[PDB]
Design a protein around this ligand. Structure first.
Ligand SMILES: Nc1ncnc2c1ncn2[C@@H]1O[C@H](COP(=O)(O)OP(=O)(O)O)[C@@H](O)[C@H]1O
Ligand SMILES: O=C1c2ccccc2N=C2N(c3ccccc3)CC[C@@]12O
Ligand code: VO4
Ligand SMILES: [Mg+2]
Ligand SMILES: [Mg+2]
Length: 703
């Protein structure tokens, strides 16, 4: 038993290290301590002070430098240090902000990133490798109850799996966190663990799905070098006997705008850098490829490499993963042709002709794109600069200017890339679809809460998704929990835990009165609407009317939303075009005639290519977003949830650097302390009258 052996890797890496005789002396001390703010302007910066005296209502304590006094009602008492490193913080005597943070600090300082906070797991990103995910670690956790073993993502994965078998009920693992917190890395460990303990080719294909999805769907942002730019719900499927029988990836809207634009220091999707770094010399000749600095879509941000990442070595991994999942050699070729042709399209330079319409004087990029896509360059050229539309019923060739031609070219690119992504996921899913499931454990890995210098429509939807997920945690931990006590009349006084995202949710997606997204959609079919009339309308509805909305005084093009995780200012530029997501039909006609078998599916397969109709108009992106979100929330309601709260230590992506204010903001807005308090004060378990106690209408309830 490595569990009981102090020299095991299990002890070394997952257990608090043996304290020494000096620490023993400190542990048995009769002295008492308080967490205080040396600077009251700075509420999250705490030191420890000895309590030197008390009255009926106050403590006096030493400060690190004088003596101060504080009302006992305002005092954040330090826990007896025997609590330092505790595995489940519901056991702390004093439940307060600096004490919770301190316990996480003690564990983190020893590379103990997992800690229970009552019923849910907290995971603080190490930003370095820690050897706790080996097969040997997996074997240890196999079938062990949560209290029998150290905190670990494997442990909560096992708890769900046993609950699935024992209760014959589908489960979910909901991993929350702002961008860079560790959601995707924990998601991968859950999958790894389930595939190992419930496993028997299929298991390898489930695992190899991920490098394919990341190469194409992750990118370096200023918050995360491997940022997920699409969310996913992964259903791991099991038969009646509890063995893995398939899996299904639900992917959510991809940030397509990143293909054509990246902010300074950021990167485009990894795949672009992987192709250019890892392609053979004549893979490169045949695709007309050179270095990333040669491509407008890769040379704007100032960043082409990521610290510690070999794009060439990752390319090998992406190709191996494609082999294992079963993409043919021609399919793969076609994939890279699409990637290369996108880079070429981005190199097309429109200019003004004799009139207002654009021309193409240099056709090098156009011809290179058309060659790799297998389309006609004259046709493509005409579809870019002179697309035909209806005017009433007449067919009228437009002649677009430089800016409109360039926008149209970008539209074609984003559609190519988003449709390729959907096709990758479809292909992967068909391979993993080998049996009707009996049960599933779904793992949710969304794009996490994020704030940039410039926040756009995509950031509003990402942040709203994170808001909705926090609301789901609030509903499960506090609201449904107390509704049960009160449906069962068990002598409970209702506690207002002060966590309600409802006002922010309503602001964004309210129906009557219409919220932000409804108003966006209204403006999107209003024939003369502009981004300026859009923000005017938002201001007219919400400015000084909605407490979560701010019309800023320093800008006419931004509005503020107060999210659970902080206020975010949103830039309105391009929201109508983003929401309408137009593409010229002549571009689709051009690509429907491609000689490439993959390209042709992207344009002819209605499940990839066709867009749904809302009466007279195509479904907007906001409406697509809402359907996906509603479908997700509906699926989660069919499941028993388990929450993992990923916590980023700092905003620098560095190990061994826990920052007080960064971490405490997350513990606050995540509701971690509230969640510990409900665990303590409530009655987690109840059985119908079954053959520190409460007798309800139909049920026994216990602490
Ligand atoms: N448990 C972990 N072990 C080692 N590194 C991790 C762990 N969790 C996160 N990281 C590091 O942090 C980065 C960001 O984490 P990730 O899971 O991609 O964040 P997100 O929450 O945005 O999905 C990873 O690429 C890796 O460098
Ligand atoms: O987590 C997500 C997500 C999860 C559920 C439903 C929709 C989602 N949308 C997401 N995104 C999005 C991108 C462009 C426009 C709008 C949204 C990016 C992350 C996302 O897929
Ligand atoms: O940076 V993460 O979008 O994968 O939350
Ligand atoms: Mg991620
Ligand atoms: Mg600004």
């Amino acid at each position: 038993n490595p569990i009981h052996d102090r020299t095991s890797d299990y002890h070394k890496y997952l257990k608090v290290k043996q304290g020494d005789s000096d620490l023993f002396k400190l542990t048995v001390s009769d002295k008492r301590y308080i967490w205080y703010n040396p600077d009251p302007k700075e509420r999250d910066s705490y030191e420890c002070g000895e309590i030197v005296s008390e009255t009926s209502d106050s403590f006096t304590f030493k400060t690190v430098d004088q003596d101060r006094q504080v009302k006992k009602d305002d005092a954040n008492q330090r826990n007896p240090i025997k609590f330092d490193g505790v595995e489940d913080m519901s056991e702390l005597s004093y439940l307060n902000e600096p004490a919770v943070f301190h316990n996480l600090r003690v564990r983190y300082n020893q590379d103990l990133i997992y800690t229970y906070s009552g019923l849910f797991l907290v995971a603080v990103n190490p930003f370095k490798r820690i050897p706790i995910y080996t097969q040997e670690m997996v074997d240890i956790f196999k079938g062990r109850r949560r209290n029998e073993v150290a905190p670990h993502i494997f442990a909560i994965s096992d708890v769900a799996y046993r609950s699935m078998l024992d209760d014959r009920q589908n489960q979910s693992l909901l991993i929350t966190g702002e961008s860079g917190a560790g959601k995707t890395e924990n998601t991968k460990k859950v999958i790894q663990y389930l595939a190992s303990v419930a496993g028997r080719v299929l298991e390898q294909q489930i695992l190899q799905a991920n490098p394919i999805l990341e190469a194409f769907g992750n990118a370096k942002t200023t918050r995360n070098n491997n940022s997920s730019r699409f969310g996913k719900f992964i259903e791991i499927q099991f038969n009646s006997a509890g063995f893995i029988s398939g899996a299904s990836i639900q992917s959510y809207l991809l940030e397509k705008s990143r293909v054509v634009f990246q902010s300074e220091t950021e990167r485009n999707y990894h795949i672009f850098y992987q192709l250019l770094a890892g392609a053979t010399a004549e893979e490169k000749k045949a695709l007309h490829l050179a270095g990333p600095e040669s491509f407008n879509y890769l040379n704007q941000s100032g960043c082409v490499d990521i610290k510690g990442v070999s794009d060439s070595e990752e390319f090998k991994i992406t190709r191996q993963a494609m082999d294992i999942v079963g993409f043919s050699q021609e399919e793969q070729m076609s994939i890279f042709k699409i990637i290369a042709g996108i880079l070429h399209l981005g190199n097309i330079k429109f200019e003004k002709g004799a009139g207002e319409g654009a021309v193409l004087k240099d056709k090098t990029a156009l011809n290179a794109a058309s060659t790799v896509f297998g389309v006609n360059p004259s046709v493509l050229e005409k579809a870019l600069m002179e697309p035909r539309i209806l005017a009433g019923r007449d067919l009228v060739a437009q002649h677009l200017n430089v800016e409109k031609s360039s926008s149209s070219r970008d539209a074609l690119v984003k559609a190519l890339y988003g449709r390729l992504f959907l096709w990758l996921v479809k292909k992967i899913n068909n391979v993993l679809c080998q049996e009707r499931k009996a049960y599933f454990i779904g793992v949710l890995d969304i794009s996490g809460f994020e704030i940039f210098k410039v926040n756009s429509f995509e950031q509003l939807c990402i942040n709203y998704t994170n808001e909705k997920l926090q609301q789901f945690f609030n509903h499960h931990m506090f609201k449904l929990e107390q509704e049960e006590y009160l449906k069962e009349k068990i002598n409970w006084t209702f506690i207002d835990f002060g966590l309600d995202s409802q006002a922010t949710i309503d602001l964004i997606d309210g129906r009557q009165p219409p919220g932000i997204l409804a108003l966006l959609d209204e403006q999107s079919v209003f024939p003369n609407a502009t981004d300026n009339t859009l923000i005017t309308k938002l201001h007219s509805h919400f400015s000084k009317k909605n407490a979560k909305y701010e019309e800023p005084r320093f800008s006419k093009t931004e509005f503020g939303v107060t999210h659970y995780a902080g206020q975010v200012m949103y830039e309105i530029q391009d929201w109508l075009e983003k929401n309408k997501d137009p593409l010229q039909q002549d571009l689709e006609l051009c690509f429907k005639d491609s000689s490439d078998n993959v390209v042709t599916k992207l344009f002819n397969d209605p499940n990839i290519a066709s867009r749904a109709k809302k009466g007279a108009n195509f479904i907007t992106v906001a409406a697509q977003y809402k359907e996906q979100l509603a479908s997700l929330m509906a699926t989660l309601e069919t499941t028993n949830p388990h929450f993992v709260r990923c916590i980023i230590p700092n905003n620098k992506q560095l190990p061994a650097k826990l920052e007080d204010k960064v971490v405490l903001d997350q513990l606050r807005c995540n509701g971690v302390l509230e969640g510990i308090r409900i665990t303590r004060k409530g009655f987690p378990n109840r059985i119908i009258y079954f053959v520190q106690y409460r007798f309800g209408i139909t049920k026994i309830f216990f602490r």
